[PDB]
């Protein structure tokens, strides 16, 4: 069995048992994490990856803590770029966890890993079998499995190519579903994992998941130096997994939304596939295989299967007091989606839809988080309405009705789409890019401390 | 017994037991595939084919992975054209799966298949008894059974003739029902297999199965370089089986909708039959028999028996913002169809029809997927209405009412058919073509790696 | 007991036990065949014929596969004209089934049948005791029983005379009821066997059993080269038994609707009887007796006893978009017929009649297939109406009311009959013709195959 640190009466345990049928998932709650689900998923994700891959294979852990990786029989070789403030504490914790294992293991190469840390604290740029201080672009070790566990700040094709040229033929990416960022939403939620993310421009909104505003009477309106008149989603996004905050860029998030087939054509050439192997309510495990030489052709399309509904709607909020409208995305449980089918046959108001959603939810054992019921309600009310206007404005079969621009071009009226509702068992198809061909860090007071611990 | 990787409480298990009464189907879920049904069908399809065919026969596998085929007592000879990015990984996986079997089998010719891969990585163009790197038109092996398991990108008559000239007298094609492509629909669904397909022109539709659109206010309408005024189904189609995406061409799909009898008359002559041996909710197993010399005659008709209802309707969507109408097809469960019979005796609105369909579905144990209930509802409402207009516009028995074109020709008013509903136990009859008479790939870094694995 | 390949909970098993009281009918489903009923009838029909006929008799099998006939103790002599594409595969299958029986039988003349195929592939025109490559007109064997199992493409009097001059005194014809073709219907259904047939002119109808149409907006009406103005039933008809398609001609179908007595008087003379020995819901077994010399006289009448109701109505459809009306026939279960008796005492609308039929059917255990419920409903509503107009227009007893054509002839108004309803336990009486007096195929590449298999 596999023990997950979630409450025994948790409703996420069934979702987590479906996503992992090959395991016996048992709750062993030992810590009141506010993002316990996001970790109960990744623990099982590594448990599954370690079964799929060959035991005699060497694994590379990009941006991962070496502390969690030991006590495992797999030949891990963690690569620690030390790009953030957690890596020095991660290395301190690794050195400290090795000390309590000097003799009480004699099964997990502890006596080799102590030597491996002291030998890399002797020479920093060195390449040891199970530890190094390089970036994933800088490491010189040769393996055949790579694992990107919660690694979003990396450009996908560049890093994948740099792993492939080192002999990596299999790669696993455990992370959040990058689909809300291909639809290019402003703010969004992963409610089953207590995760909220927002574009920095709307961090002062009133009521979205990740926001914080102030009280006011609305009588100033004079402090605009330069007009915006344009509130598109910029590049910087902030994620809050429970209470843990991470900054990301939309570019490096969208880069991991890889197509089914792509080509990495640098000094060497590889043809690569990307398969979503696990998917639970917004948290995915993707499998990339890379093989030498160009084979086949690439369509440049990426598919997302929706097991649970996916909404993206236009919501009206007040960012920093100013009433704007932007796009918010969320995941709705497939049960709620299936039970709204009959009501969305007509035009329902957001009040009626919210009362019906609260009924379906409470029927204290909630199916979906309630902070998303208002917006979802509004989303449904818009969708059901835009479905009636499609029915009243029936066109002719196979014809269009373009209008001349009066010089040489044609014009067609665009309709206003306020909601994109991807029901369960539908798919999203996004045109992405394939055919990619365009591919220190530690102090002395720390280097003295990491080997003093051993 | 035969073990299928679907969960024990699945409702597809009963449908899968009906399609295979000669087996006892046991659920053995070990993986949360989002297209587990489409594979639980094909596993049993190969189990059935291997019983029907003679054990002393040689089998050819067009476009199939050699990995899955071993551990079978049948004399397989897989032909691997390496036409896509999966065949290199398929060969890597085959070479890796052979290594774990060097000695632990001594029953499935593992020690012969290792040498058989070594002999083809020594000479590429060689023809070995159980493996080759050719296409189906290029392979030179002589067998008597061919199997096309999920092989849609091949022209049926050409490939079948090239198998027949090599002594193949029996062929099996396991695939999706090619009937939605003879009615020439724009988009469609196989909802029991979580499969959606769409013509590339409508991949930016709002709400069909395989689509993805954006939010907008509909106030630009100026970017048409050249008018379309014509939205007929073009040749390129994209399939999403769960989350696995494949591109297909309507020509090569319609190619496999073979008639009951046809003739392959090239340098040699064969008379051939095509029998649908298995069909489950949109997934068929066809049996082609080929015999030397022309016998009988061909009427050129292809029949599809509908066990579950088949709808094709005109839906109004907004592709990339533009409100168009195109044809969508889907499969409706025979129970839903039978329970809709009484309501379709009059004119029902799509709202009433959708509420009634939701009632019949929920009566949490859904009979049909709900994302298809709206369109189906609309379809029914149109059909029930076009059935009343046939009754109000009663004609005379055996006469027509053509009108002179005023020169020498006659004119008859055509009526608008918005829905084609093929109820359970009806049949589709399509005029197709019979009488056919008009019939490398591997790199060095991979050929080095395949034999290093063994 | 006799084992039929139908599901254990099938509702056709009761009807099949009534049609064969002398047998123990046991369901042994081993194949998901879409026309399992049509074969569960014929298997029992041959079981019955083999009991009725004398064991020391020689049997002739017209157009039958020799493969199914062996393993039977009866002295069969199959005649294989090789008129279609199934006979070459039938012979391949026979040669293959003999090979698996060379030694494991020593009870069914396997060692004699192998030599009998080798002797006929040595000389083609030869006449061997249990196999020949002739037609039924060309075979020179002398027997005393003939069996026509699903043989519709043969002219009945000519074939029967050619069998009689060879000493055949008993003949059996297992087939579909040829009564819908004596009423000369355009399309029709045998719904208990999943069989639909249509005249080729209406294969593009919208909603009948065997058809397939397209979507359209009805705005072309310009492509008629020559007017029809006349939609009578032509000679070519297509049958779909489940999904198996056969073409037949109305002439050779009506040929087997033989009268109770007829005379075959050519170079020799025979007086012949035709009795329907078995009848199940549209599938009959007819027994023809032929004796030398002319005896008695012939009324030239053929009778059909209706155990289940038989409808033929005028339905309005749209063939290829053009709204026409033609005649469709179907079989209604005697229970549905009996339970509609009280409603048809007045004028019921097709909507009310369809809701009532759906009530009686569902009262998921359907009595009749639902795709025939609308048309049947309409049929009933017409019949019940034409029965009221007979009652309101009461004539005088034994008189007519002809009107002079003003020259020398008389005229009577003909009434419009839109429905012919033959209730259960009624009979149809048709004036047919009696007194009849107007009465290679294999290549080398196959003849090399057939004895190579043995
Ligand atoms: Zn390293
Ligand atoms: Zn080969
Ligand atoms: Zn003969």
Swiss-Prot record, chains A, B, C:
Identify the catalytic residues: 35 (for mrna-capping enzyme nsp1 activity)
Q: Which residue(s) hold a covalent lipid per the annotation (S-palmitoyl cysteine)? A: 406, 408
Q: What interactions and quaternary structure are annotated?
A: Homododecamer. The enzyme forms a membrane-associated dodecameric ring with a central channel for the exchange of between the viral replication factories and the host cytoplasm. Interacts with non-structural protein 3. Interacts with RNA-directed RNA polymerase nsP4. Interacts with protease nsP2. Interacts with itself. Interacts with host STING1; this interaction results in inhibition of cGAS-STING signaling and increased levels of palmitoylation and protein stabilization of nsP1. Interacts with host TMEM45B; this interaction leads to viral replication inhibition.
Q: How is it modified after translation?
A: Palmitoylated by host palmitoyltransferases ZDHHC2 and ZDHHC19. Palmitoylation is increased by the interacton with host STING1.
The compartments listed are: Host cytoplasmic vesicle membrane; Host cell membrane; Host cell projection, Host filopodium
Give the protein name, as stated in the record. Answer: mRNA-capping enzyme nsP1
What does the entry's free-text domain comment contain? Answer: The N-terminus binds a zinc ion which stabilizes this region. The C-terminus is disordered.
Where is each Alphavirus-like MT domain found? 26-257
Organism of origin is Chikungunya virus (strain S27-African prototype) (CHIKV)
Q: How does it sit in the membrane?
A: Lipid-anchor
Detail which positions bind Zn(2+). Answer: 77, 127, 132, 139
* Sites annotated Involved in the phosphoramide link with 7-methyl-GMP: 35
Describe the task this protein carries out.
Answer: Cytoplasmic capping enzyme that catalyzes two virus-specific reactions: methyltransferase and guanylyltransferase. mRNA-capping is necessary since all viral RNAs are synthesized in the cytoplasm, and host capping enzymes are restricted to the nucleus. The enzymatic reaction involves a covalent link between 7-methyl-GMP and nsP1, whereas eukaryotic capping enzymes form a covalent complex only with GMP.
Report the portion of the entire protein shown.
Answer: 3 to 472 of 2474
> Which residues lie within the region annotated Membrane-binding and oligomerization?
293-439
């Amino acid at each position: 069995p596999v023990y997950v640190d979630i409450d025994a009466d948790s409703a996420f345990l069934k979702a987590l048992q479906r996503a992992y049928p090959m395991f016996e998932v048992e709750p062993r709650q030992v810590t009141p994490n506010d993002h316990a689900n996001a970790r109960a998923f990744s623990h099982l994700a590594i448990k599954l990856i370690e079964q799929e891959i060959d035991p005699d294979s060497t694994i590379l852990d990009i941006g991962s803590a070496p502390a969690r990786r030991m006590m495992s029989d797999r030949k891990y070789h963690c690569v620690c770029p030390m790009r953030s403030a957690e890596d020095p504490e991660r290395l301190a914790n690794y050195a400290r966890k090795l000390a309590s294992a000097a003799g009480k293991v004699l099964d997990r190469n502890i006596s080799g890993k102590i030597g491996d840390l002291q030998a890399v604290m002797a020479v920093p740029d060195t390449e040891t079998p199970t530890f190094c201080l390089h970036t994933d672009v800088s490491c010189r070790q040769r393996a055949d499995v790579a694992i990107y566990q919660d690694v979003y700040a990396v450009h996908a094709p560049t890093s994948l190519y740099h792993q492939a040229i080192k002999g990596v033929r299999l790669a696993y990416w455990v992370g959040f579903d990058t689909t809300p960022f291909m639809y290019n939403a402003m703010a969004g939620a992963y409610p089953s994992y207590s995760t909220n993310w927002a574009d920095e421009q709307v961090l002062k909104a009133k009521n979205i998941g990740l926001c914080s505003t102030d009280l006011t009477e609305g009588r100033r309106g004079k402090l605009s130096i330069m007009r915006g008149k344009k509130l598109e989603p910029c590049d910087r996004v902030l994620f809050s997994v429970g209470s843990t905050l991470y900054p990301e860029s939309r570019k490096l998030l969208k880069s991991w939304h890889l197509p089914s087939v792509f080509h990495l054509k640098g000094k060497l050439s590889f043809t690569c596939r990307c398969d979503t192997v696990v998917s639970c309510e917004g948290y995915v495990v993707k499998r990339i295989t890379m093989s030498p030489g160009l084979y086949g052709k690439t369509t440049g399309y990426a598919v997302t299967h929706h097991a649970d509904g996916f909404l993206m709607c236009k919501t009206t909020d007040t960012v920093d007091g100013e009433r704007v409208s932007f796009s918010v995305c969320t995941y709705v449980p497939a049960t709620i989606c299936d039970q709204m089918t009959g009501i969305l046959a007509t035009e329902v108001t957001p009040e009626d839809a919210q009362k019906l959603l609260v009924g379906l939810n409470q029927r204290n054992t909630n199916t979906m988080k309630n902070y998303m019921i208002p917006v979802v309600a509004q989303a449904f009310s818009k969708w059901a309405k835009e479905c009636r206007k499609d029915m009243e404005d029936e066109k002719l079969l196979g014809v269009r009705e373009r209008t001349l621009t009066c010089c040489c071009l044609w014009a067609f009226k665009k309709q206003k789409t306020h909601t994109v509702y991807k029901r369960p068992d539908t798919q999203s198809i996004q045109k992405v890019q394939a055919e990619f061909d365009s591919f220190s860090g530690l102090s002395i007071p720390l280097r003295t401390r990491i080997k003093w611990l051993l």
